[model samples]
Target: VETFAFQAEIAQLMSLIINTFYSNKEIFLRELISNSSDALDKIRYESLTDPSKLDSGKELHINLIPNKQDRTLTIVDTGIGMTKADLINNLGTIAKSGTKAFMEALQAGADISMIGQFGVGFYSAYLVAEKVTVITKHNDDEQYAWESSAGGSFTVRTDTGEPMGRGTKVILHLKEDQTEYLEERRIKEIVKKHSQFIGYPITLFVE
Candidate 1:
């Protein structure tokens, strides 16, 4: 697994939220869902321009897998997944993109509904998770895994996991206080509140 350091600004950005912002832990699910929706939008737009992009005929949808026994939850989307380069460019230097606007809004004390608007939503997972694992397969690149837990850096490596055709899966190793997120009712309620009108189907794992 090759490793890389987060940029200086993002390192501080990481500290600002991961160690703070406990009140809105449930927003982690909303942010993840919002991200997948964007990925879906991307793929749909790309497919219109390049018809073969949908050769697999994969329809986009969101799936939630809450494994109580493993103390983990997984959010899956059949959409435009991250390529190897994307894992580095998008998830790597998080602070370098879409963050200044968010910081300014934060200081203004205004209602910050769409934190994802500035891409900080992904990191919101840290509010209720000790670790996060992203496994993604893009139509244009080989599968890869990006994972992080503690201070300032993450590792990306070739993924040996089962083939997903094309999509991304975000696995969260929940913190002790956030275990309720594993409950189906809890997830359903949150979806009702934050993602009820999202275009794609949102399904929860049962049994």
Candidate 2:
């Protein structure tokens, strides 16, 4: 596995974001699902120019799989995935363009619910996860994983276990106290409240 450090500024900003949420931690699901939706949208857009990109044949949708035995929740999306370079540039650190705006908005008292505009919404996973694993396969590149504990560094490696043929999967190693998210009823409630209107299906695996 190859390792990379978060830009010093990003490390600090990450802590700021984690500690900023007071009572809206549940919104982490919303942010994550929103991201999955965006990925689905990207793949849909690409299929217009190059229809062969859908050769993976996976249906376009999102799946929530919670494994109680492992105490991990995996969110999978059959959408446009990311390459190793994307794992570095996108997940390695907050985007330069987004950093300024994220800081400004945070300092101005904007709530965590609005952080999506900065494109660092992925970090919201820290609201409940002690660590997060993002595994993705782009149509043009091999599968790779980017993992971090919201610390100074993250690791990236060629992923042998596919999240999907051409999409992304985010596995949240939930904090010890975040068990509520592991419940089927709880997840359904959150999705119903926050994403009922989402264009694509967000299915929760019941068994």
Candidate 3:
């Protein structure tokens, strides 16, 4: 088994993103929803090659569920679900994260558009989650669950109950300081501000 490791500079970069870029707790929702939108794009692009696979009948959407009682926030999406291999490759290591390559490209005047193609954006969840659980149902296989604290290791196993239909649900154990996200008005404000132009419907429900 290959052990996952973050590069030395990448640790610095992760600190910058988690500490600096997301200083405002509300930014967490914005970033997660944006990631949901990107997941939709992945399936849409993939469908071009395997049309039958698109029969899952999912429309792109993001749903935010804040559980004040449990101190948890769930970001759900009807988007491309990650397979076991994807979970291993994407979360278990930072192999494709081209940090050095992106820096070199910038120096050489090459576009950095493909920076995230390296697959590290999902790690942004660490900025907000004390413990993260991802429940996903892929079109081609049975449901599965992946979890981690982002403390350098993660565990994956097949889901044990009724499937989640076809999509992904990310549950975040909110930090004490982030309970503000549980309020409806604040979540709406953040979504409208950063993701109003996003190409999918994002809903925040209040209970």
Candidate 4:
């Protein structure tokens, strides 16, 4: 398993970014589902060349599953899954963020017309998930599970069950202060706001 090294300054920088940069906490779910959509797009493009990559029985969709009993919410997709190394580089640091850079570029260009960049927006998930767990199964690689708390480091391991045919499932263990995020109204509202125009269907499950 690979580990991420963050300079003390970067850690502080991340804290500032996560806490202050995002004006809306609900934007977290949108950012995540949007990222999932982008992953699906990548996999779909690859499937044009390799049909085996499209083996998942489910349609390409993003699902929000909330478990009131566990106080957990899971966002799942039948999209491209990240390998262990990807989890390290993608989730473990900011430098690997293309979306973040795109946003930076846009701001520099003074273009507010294009919104919803990918990289830094993902950190929004930490607004709710005190601990986040992602189980991903790629079409070409072994399935793996990645676990992390917002601040320090993350752990990667083999998945506990059968790998998802080709996709990702992100489970958010909500913090006490973020319980509203698990509510149906809140989730549905966020999905409607950020993903109503998404190419794939986005569903919110309640129990």
User: Per-residue error at 52 for model 4, in Å?
Assistant: 1.9
TM-scores of the candidates in the order shown: 0.93, 0.94, 0.76, 0.82
lDDT string, candidate 1, 125-148, tens digits: 887789999999888899899988
Query: Backbone clashes in each candidate structure, one number apiece?
Result: 0, 0, 0, 0
Candidate 2 lDDT by residue in tens digits, 106-149: 77988777877888788788888999999998888998989999
User: How well does candidate 2 match the true structure in TM-score terms?
Assistant: 0.94
Model 4: runs farther than 4 Å from truth? 1-10, 17-23, 92-118
List ranges where model 1 is wrong by over 4 Å: 92-94, 111-114
Tens digit of per-residue lDDT, candidate 3, span 8-37: 655544554455443544555666776788
Residue pairs with backbone overlap in model 1: none
- In terms of lDDT, which candidate is stronger, 3 or 4? 4
Ranking by lDDT: 2, 1, 4, 3
Best by lDDT: 2
Every candidate's lDDT: 0.83, 0.85, 0.69, 0.72
Ranking by TM-score: 2, 1, 4, 3
TM-score, cand. 1: 0.93
Candidate 3 clashing pairs, residues 3+ apart or interchain: none
Candidate 4 on 25-102: residue-level lDDT in tens? 676787788779888898888888988767664378889999988989999999888877677665523544544565
